[PDB]
Amino acid sequence: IEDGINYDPNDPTRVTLSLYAPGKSFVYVIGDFTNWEVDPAYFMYRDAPRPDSVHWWITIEGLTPGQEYAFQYFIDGELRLADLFAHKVLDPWHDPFIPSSTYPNLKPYPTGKTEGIVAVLQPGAPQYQWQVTDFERPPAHELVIYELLIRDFVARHDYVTLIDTLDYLERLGVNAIELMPVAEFDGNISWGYNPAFHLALDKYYGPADDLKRFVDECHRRGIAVILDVVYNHATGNSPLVQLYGPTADNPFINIPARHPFNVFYDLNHEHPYIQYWLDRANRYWLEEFRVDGFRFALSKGFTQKYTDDDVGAWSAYDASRIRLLKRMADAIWAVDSTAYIILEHFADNQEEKELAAYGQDRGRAGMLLWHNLNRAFSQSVMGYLNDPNFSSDLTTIYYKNRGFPTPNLIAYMESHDEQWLMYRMRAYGARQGAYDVRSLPVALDRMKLAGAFFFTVPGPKMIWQFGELGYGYGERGEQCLEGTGDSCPSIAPGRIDPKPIRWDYRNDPLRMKLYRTWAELLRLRREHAVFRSPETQVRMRLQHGVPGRWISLTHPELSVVVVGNFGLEPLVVTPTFPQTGTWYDYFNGDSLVVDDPNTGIELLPGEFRLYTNRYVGQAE
């Protein structure tokens, strides 16, 4: 028996319920099967081998196979608690706003019979029949991740509609989709970082069997699914907060929070029960939904070290935090030894290297770390390469330039937390004579240039929905993310508010040229190990204040030189080619004779070229 809702795989008429709650006096289960009455038949047993090891349990018999039943734990005659480990809840405040087209035949809340969120159990639930048997998840260091917010990716905000986008995403060339948080969050409209029931699937994105269908369809196409998951904190509607209240006596939480950038109730990751709950949650999402791994939101928050409001002190090497993340990783990898462990960390490099290295001596991939290059790419595509406050240096895109021995950094130009590059170019872009980065066609060309200096570099990569169509700025500047330092127009939505959905951008040939350029770069990357391999030898000229930029890659199967003009006027850019001879322009189909490794190439502002040391075809 574990805490939560324990089905009997051989008896669909019963369930065993178990709650961890030291310090309580008595518990009744109330629910549909008690007619929401307090009944002595539903008085829970107290199992208390030690005062800090108290579990309340009962076996409920005589249920109808396949029927849903709402229930709560009614504790001490004063607290009505939905199970911490519920996989579905009914929310009386927000469920009325979920269309039947989003969640067909949604069980009505027991209005007037109880109050607060209720848990749902369903013995003998019909089982989704998984179709894909032989899916091989991409190597962790080869991930090309599409970060997706279901709320703002499709107007219907649901799993069944996501399935209809997979031809578009597969053609773009990503090999993983990262869903922003799908676990039950307060309300319906959210980015998802207000989790209430961390093992329940939020019903506003549709039923669980539709997420299973989505994962199965991704797997059919060779695409992994990563879940963004939020374990730093819990809202006031979490049973971790409600069981003892937001009080000094609640051992699960920290008030005040132990570190900066906390929201809601900071959790105590040193508490053995929080470790149990975390492990249960990671195991559940892997086992039930067959997802390929997790992006751990605010993993730097997994510590009891007190740094108050000191971000520098928080980001410093924290041995306690490293222990807790290795402990969590051991439990994940005991469930599934190749599950992705992705940290949204932003700790000092000493700590990040140690987390990346963990398990590699035992055949594990190590942990992957978010690597934010939004500001450096922003400066680079805006055409401001000499700002003393905002570096344009892209050198650290390659893992060895960040001091890492292995490709465990997920670089991104964009994430849901960062400004759109297209906003920055259209809002602030540089100009010289006739060349204006604020002009939409010029800005789209600079995103092609940015892609050529991003998708070509070994190690995993992430892109944020619709960057490939030039999302940002929009009609008048409304496509602007608040809270990045930029003063968004008055017409922009709030940072966390719904953003415009613009699939009509597929009908703009200029925006589709950007999509097709990124798709062609990702096809090159898929087809040629040079772009992906930890054995690739990399040289680069991506420094701050250098407009004439280049990357060289050498590998046994292919050598590559990427050249780009991040300036505002025509420029001769002189890469060091790794070998003399004839090189082949992949996009333009022409040749380049290199008889001096230092060969100058005149480029228009915003232009890139990609050369290979042998003919490998042409962009379509």
Ligand SMILES: OC[C@H]1O[C@H](O[C@H]2[C@H](O)[C@@H](O)[C@@H](OC[C@H]3O[C@H](O[C@H]4[C@H](O)[C@@H](O)[C@H](O)O[C@@H]4CO)[C@H](O)[C@@H](O)[C@@H]3O[C@H]3O[C@H](CO)[C@@H](O)[C@H](O)[C@H]3O)O[C@@H]2CO)[C@H](O)[C@@H](O)[C@@H]1O
């Ligand atoms: O209540 C009405 C509002 O509800 C919704 O808003 C939600 C929001 O969608 C949800 O994410 C959550 O916001 C918390 C913070 O989320 C983000 O930060 C996370 C990062 O994006 C993520 O990458 C990282 O891993 O984790 C971060 C959280 O630790 C935003 O960047 C923050 O701005 C959000 O904070 C805001 O809310 C908090 C707490 O309420 C507030 O203290 C903070 O100062 C704010 O800055 O919770 C929100 C509800 O509170 C809906 O989306 C809104 O449109 C609606 O008005």
Ligand SMILES: OC[C@H]1O[C@H](O[C@H]2[C@H](O)[C@@H](O)[C@@H](O[C@H]3[C@H](O)[C@@H](O)[C@@H](O)O[C@@H]3CO)O[C@@H]2CO)[C@H](O)[C@@H](O)[C@@H]1O
């Ligand atoms: O005024 C001359 C000024 O030009 C250049 O500065 C540019 C910045 O480099 C660039 O980031 C952008 O600044 C915006 C920030 O990105 C944004 O986050 C917010 O802070 O608003 C800024 C615009 O006000 O654009 C400016 C040019 O306007 C150059 O690099 C500077 O050295 C120089 O002083």
Ligand SMILES: [Ca+2]
């Ligand atoms: Ca919800």
Ligand SMILES: [Mn+2]
């Ligand atoms: Mn924390």
